[PDB]
Amino acid sequence: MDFSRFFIDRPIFAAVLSILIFITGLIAIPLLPVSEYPDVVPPSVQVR
Amino acid sequence: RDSIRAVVQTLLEAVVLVVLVVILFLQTWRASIIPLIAVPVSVVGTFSILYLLGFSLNTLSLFGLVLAIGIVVDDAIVVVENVERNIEEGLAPLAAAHQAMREVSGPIIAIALVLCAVFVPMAFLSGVTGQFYKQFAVTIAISTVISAINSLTLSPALAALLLKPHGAKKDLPTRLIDRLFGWIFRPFNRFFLRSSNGYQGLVSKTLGRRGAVFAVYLLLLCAAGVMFKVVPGGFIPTQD
Amino acid sequence: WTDLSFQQATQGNTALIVFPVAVLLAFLVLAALYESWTLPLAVILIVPMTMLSALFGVWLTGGDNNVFVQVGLVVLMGLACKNAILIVEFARELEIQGKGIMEAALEACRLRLRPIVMTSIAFIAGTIPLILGHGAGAEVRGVTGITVFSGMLGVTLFGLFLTPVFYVTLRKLVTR
Ligand SMILES: CCCCCCCCCCCCO[C@@H]1O[C@H](CO)[C@@H](O[C@H]2O[C@H](CO)[C@@H](O)[C@H](O)[C@H]2O)[C@H](O)[C@H]1O
Ligand SMILES: CCCCCCCCCCCCO[C@@H]1O[C@H](CO)[C@@H](O[C@H]2O[C@H](CO)[C@@H](O)[C@H](O)[C@H]2O)[C@H](O)[C@H]1O
């Protein structure tokens, strides 16, 4: 609770931390590939 | 090859000059030691991390190293300016270092963090221009982090042991510099005092006429913009 | 299109989301250090001032804003950032020790005056070897050196003068 003790007396620090997390996620979303399902289709090789 | 020699030449230069500067301001052989150790082990240490991230020595990365030695020195100076200023206000060198790092320690990690905040995103720029920026940025940022670790661990400690209380006695080294190079010590220490005093006078008046300071900063930033777009753009400059 | 012209024609401009993301990121860190949403602007708002100054060296010469001088510009404004950060934190801590805002900023400038000038004079003494000497890549080393001179001059002058004005201005509209 000394962790929380430090943070409640420094609320701007807490806001900054939550905003940093939110910002990294916000810049991550456009970078992520949009598919249906994770990659589970097994790769195959054709020999002709 | 030339770039390599540059990165070593400048480094030794960066040592020599910095030690001169400290003996001019913190006039003791004691303090001059510690940036002489601080700035090499930083830049050289950079190489290790540069290896782990798969980079290579090249004109651009070594250029970034040459740029980064400067912030490395700057950290060393701030640390020992503060510790010897503690000794000046009359603290034992160990307690001097304690108070000094209480004053600037958490700052230093904050400035390392903001420097990373401005430098690391440069590695994700686009275009071959961006791939050059990437070498510059990564080299500078890892040098910043290593230099901050050095400024928080080795430099303050080495100040604590190396430096003794002010006055004490100008020792063998210190007596040598005192006699030999007291040639030009005093005139410009006292000129520095007078220039200081003028400085707080100037700020004290400007802190009264803050509206005019805002008025010049305005349209100075407009000149900055027009000049950002009239000075030629940025691409790789051709060389012999 | 072909070659690097083709790469230009297909590449995007991620700087338009790299520069802002950097800026506020620094802001966020400073906001945590100062415990203030406004005190960071004491540092940030002075860094475009050094840029012009450094850039002015190129206008002195007639060179170009090639990638090397661009990274040099960013580096010197980072140095300006660190100077401003340290003096601003010193002023704020002085205020926490019972001093008024204006005398705190005055005395913070007073304490930090010496380290800034010694760092800058060390650099500007290392700058003269960066307009002559021996070795190749002369265009690169030069186009960095002239800027480095003018930019360090701007760094010191505008830190030591604007940051106290910016600090006192910013802190007057939050104490009511
Ligand atoms: C849709 C939202 C999605 C993005 C979410 C990101 C998380 C957002 C969290 C940040 C919340 C706002 O952050 C919060 O701002 C307030 C108001 O300025 C700060 O408060 C500050 O100003 C107030 C004045 O009102 C003072 O009383 C206080 O001492 C001071 O800390 C808080 O210390 C900070 O925690
Ligand atoms: C506190 C320390 C700071 C550390 C924080 C680091 C923050 C880094 C964020 C930099 C800004 C994000 O910038 C992001 O760069 C990526 C590079 O992958 C760009 O991405 C671009 O190249 C990638 C990789 O080839 C492609 O997959 C993508 O389709 C394309 O848009 C994004 O368009 C941009 O959103």
TrEMBL record, chain A:
<feature type="transmembrane region" description="Helical">
    <location>
        <begin position="12"/>
        <end position="32"/>
    </location>
</feature>
<protein>
    <recommendedName>
        <fullName>Efflux pump membrane transporter</fullName>
    </recommendedName>
</protein>
<comment type="similarity">
    <text>Belongs to the resistance-nodulation-cell division (RND) (TC 2.A.6) family.</text>
</comment>
